[PDB]
């Protein structure tokens, strides 16, 4: 449509302790959006005081996933088409710690937009 | 005509160190009559979110070619969220154009690398500006490196001035030099 | 459009340390096309005119509205001269405008609080220069305070350098942040 | 409008210190729409191109007439290559204009001296900004001198802090003070 | 603009007595800031040039800034804001030989007054 | 605009001889800053490049800069401010060689001249 977007940007969801959780992102471009495409998802944990601790990133065609220790090797891109506006993510094997808002920010310039998923784990 | 490019506000990962994005720079080149300022700031990310004493130094090099634009190379480059911001909005505009040369460093007067060493405070509020809470960053302008025409280089050194395990969450630094003719 | 505020040449003791006027702050918040440029200097008086290594540290607040307007409420406020400087004379024009605004830090930019902190001579000419008479100052962008939308902090640091009691006469000191969009 | 006077690129041996040229000072006072940036950056020559920390200090004086024309009689004067620079192109325009006053510090602001007293590194690129090889530069604006009406003085000081003896080739500097009124 | 009835001033006055120093101004209505004066004093006595003795900001008095002359300086008038900004110097020495200067700002009104004691 | 006769050239001499390394200059009515002339010397002999060896500033010359030409270095023209920045270097020894560049300004014209020697 008219510019870049993300489709339902607020929204919880609620899974159980062991279940994977499927954290939406999709995105539409407008034909002016001509910069290089720049997505990023973060976490305000709710168990400690720090906010929008960085977990994967797309950028220049390559996946960067080192960067928040507890969520190691669980985080993963769901799609595998994702220049055409999908920045979606799974977290596996839900532990209780993570408990807290998950935030995905895309951009394409001029074009920026961002979404939040409060994400809740019970037993 | 004034120009602005920079990065945006709230910046992505855009600094790269070793091959990794590490750095979460926010820079801003602003031409007005005739000198360019640079405004920036920089937050680690990762392994690079404390910095000890025991740091190493390091460049961060934006490498742009004759007519302004910032190419793939450098350790800052043409991947990340990158352009123009016009005046009244906080948009970044990636649509080069021949103005975009004013902001680079006028290549006659930087025929040879200047440079430019500041203090350079570390989370500084936090620490209420302890005076062994600083280090150093120097740019060097036109530094040559591969086949770019112009250069900017922030370096980070000194980090054996601080007294223990920082935060890496630098002050907003200005520099300024003489601005390229259209 | 550019755009100057500022407290006019041979300012009042305008800088209030707990209920009393003690510091004689000239500030001067120039808007080019982009950045603010903060050129600033201060002159302390009574208590203040000599301060020794013990003194402690402080800061003074300027609180501004969303529409870019002084409030009565920060250490420095709307209760002394304070206004647009027309280009070409000298005099300060208290009649608020929306231009105003262009002088404030660009929210979304410093949507937290951002420092940077600088050396402050002291005395400077007299002392010529000495390496000892020099204490820190730290501008602190957009620290909540109150219910200001805007906020400029000059935060006086680290007295305890001062070999020895010192006029409180500071060097002009420059700081540079990004403008808010009208 | 705004204006700047300036030395040119790759500026001759222009600073006086005992009556010898020995400094090679390059020099941009760009006005905007009311502050003035001084952008300078200095080399040593003959026996000033390696100092010691023995060296004693010294100023370098700029002193201007009522009309912003730069006298003959400062250790920087109008026996060297100085002027307008053109928006566009850099060359160094020696026709006096109405407009070069812009460029002077503000007399009623600064109907007293002001100081700044910067940080100056030495050599920065090849010795990395080692924290021993910088020294001190102050600008002085306004000190009285003979019968000038404007005066900016560089003050290099504490040569002391050097480790041991440094090529004289100086960070480029930036300062700021409030521009004269048309 | 703002302005100061006779600017400049000498006045002659013996040990003991208490000297009034007038500082009667007139507004205009583009004077919209706020008012803000201050008295400084010159000294013969020392170099010290322009030392704060007195002020008014903020509808609110401030006097405790020169020593020598604590408790013995005061605002005559009742109402101030009103164009008079007079202060005396009650119980007069030898030591208060000097300039006196009565700078009062009402945004973009500025005037100054200058008395030799 | 200001302009130099032959901008490049190769002048070759063996030992004890003098040197004559012409740099006449033209001149135009747009040029009213000061003459402002400077010649330096980029040896074959070691790292270093561009170093001052004589000027003409203020109507008068300054002469002592590279030690290794002390003595040896003078303007030839009683007239330079006509056109004639010219230089001999008396004695020559094999140290001398190198890239000799008479830079000569005046606002805003400016120009220079590089000699192979
Ligand atoms: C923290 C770190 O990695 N420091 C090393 C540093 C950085 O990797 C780069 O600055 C990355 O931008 O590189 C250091 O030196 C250099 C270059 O200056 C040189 O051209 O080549 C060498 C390898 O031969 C290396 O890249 C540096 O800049 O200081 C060494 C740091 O330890
Ligand atoms: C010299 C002095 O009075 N220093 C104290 C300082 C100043 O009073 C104010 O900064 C003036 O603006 O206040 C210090 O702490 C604070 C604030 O941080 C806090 O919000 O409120 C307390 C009151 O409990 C006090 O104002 C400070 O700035 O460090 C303490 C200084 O010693
Ligand atoms: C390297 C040197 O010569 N330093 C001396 C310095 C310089 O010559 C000047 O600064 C050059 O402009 O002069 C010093 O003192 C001064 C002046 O400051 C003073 O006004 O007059 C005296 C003569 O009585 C002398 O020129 C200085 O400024 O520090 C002395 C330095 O040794």
Not at chain 1, 5 to 17: D, G, L, N, V, Y
């Amino acid at each position: 449509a008219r510019s870049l977007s993300i489709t339902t940007p607020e929204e919880m969801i609620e899974k159980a302790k062991g279940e994977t959780a499927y954290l939406p992102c999709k995105f539409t471009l407008s034909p002016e959006d001509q910069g290089p495409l720049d997505i990023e998802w973060l976490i305000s944990p709710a168990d400690n005081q720090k906010v929008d601790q960085v977990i994967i990133l797309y950028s220049g065609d390559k996946i960067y996933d080192d960067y928040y220790p507890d969520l190691k090797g669980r985080v993963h891109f769901t799609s595998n088409d994702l220049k055409s506006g999908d920045a979606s993510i799974n977290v596996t094997n839900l532990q209780l710690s993570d408990i807290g808002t998950y935030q995905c920010k895309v951009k394409k310039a001029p074009g920026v937009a961002n979404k939040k998923i409060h994400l809740v784990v019970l037993v | 005509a004034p120009i602005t490019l920079w990065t945006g506000p709230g910046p992505s990962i855009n600094g790269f160190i070793n091959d990794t994005p590490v750095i979460r720079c926010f820079i801003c080149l602003t031409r007005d009559s005739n000198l360019v300022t640079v405004n920036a700031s920089f937050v680690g990310e990762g392994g690079y979110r404390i910095v000890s004493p025991t740091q190493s130094q390091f460049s961060l090099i934006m490498e742009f070619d004759q007519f302004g634009q910032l190419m793939s190379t450098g350790n800052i480059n043409s991947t990340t969220t990158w352009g123009e911001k016009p005046w009244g909005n906080n948009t970044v505009q990636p649509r080069p154009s021949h103005t975009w040369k004013l902001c680079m460093p006028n290549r006659e007067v930087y025929s040879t690398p200047a440079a430019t060493i500041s203090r350079c405070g570390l989370d500084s509020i936090a620490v209420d500006g302890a005076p062994s809470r600083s280090i150093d960053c120097m740019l060097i302008i036109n530094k040559p490196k591969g086949v770019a025409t112009y250069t900017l280089t922030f370096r980070f050194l000194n980090f054996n001035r601080l007294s223990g395990g920082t935060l890496f969450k630098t002050d907003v630094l200005t520099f300024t030099y003489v601005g390229e003719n259209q």
